[PDB]
Amino acid sequence: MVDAFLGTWKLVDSKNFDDYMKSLGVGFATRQVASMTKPTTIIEKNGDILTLKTHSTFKNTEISFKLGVEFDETTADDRKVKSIVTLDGGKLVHLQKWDGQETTLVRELIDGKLILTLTHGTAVCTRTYEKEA
Numbered sequence: 749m750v751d752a753f754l755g756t757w758k759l760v761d762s763k764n765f766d767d768y769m770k771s772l773g774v775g776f777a778t779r780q781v782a783s784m785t786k787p788t789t790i791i792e793k794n795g796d797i798l799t800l801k802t803h804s805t806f807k808n809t810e811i812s813f814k815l816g817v818e819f820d821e822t823t824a825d826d827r828k829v830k831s832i833v834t835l836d837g838g839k840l841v842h843l844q845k846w847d848g849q850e851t852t853l854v855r856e857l858i859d860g861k862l863i864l865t866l867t868h869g870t871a872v873c874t875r876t877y878e879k880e881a
């Protein structure tokens with residue numbers, strides 16, 4: 749049941765995103781721009797296939813996947829990873845693997861807001877998105 753995640757979402761709060769980016773090795777100038785960017789995330793489904801778009805003034809990404817089926821992904825910061833997205837506890841959990849490393853991108857709904865928790869190494873970032881009409 750992915751349906752309450754679907755729609756267009758705008759970033760309205762960010763905590764520790766610089767720590768997360770730095771853990772991934774993102775360079776200072778990119779982190780600087782990213783710290784001032786408010787992406788729009790669009791999540792849509794067509795049958796079993798989800799498409800997740802991230803749009804900003806800096807950098808755009810798009811992925812399509814089936815829940816529970818691995819896919820190749822090239823992230824915004826140009827990591828080539830093996831990914832899987834699943835529902836776990838009502839949360840949409842995206843796991844990326846590369847070079848023996850892992851990062852998780854966990855989405856959940858709290859009071860109608862989309863909370864994205866990003867973990868890599870010891871870095872834990874929390875970003876909050878609110879839905880666009």
Ligand SMILES: CCCCCCCCCCCCC(=O)O
Pocket residue numbers: 769772774778782787789802807823824825864875
């Ligand atoms: C080139 C710009 C790279 C910026 C850092 C990207 C890190 C991985 C993706 C983070 C996604 C955050 C979000 O969807 O709010």
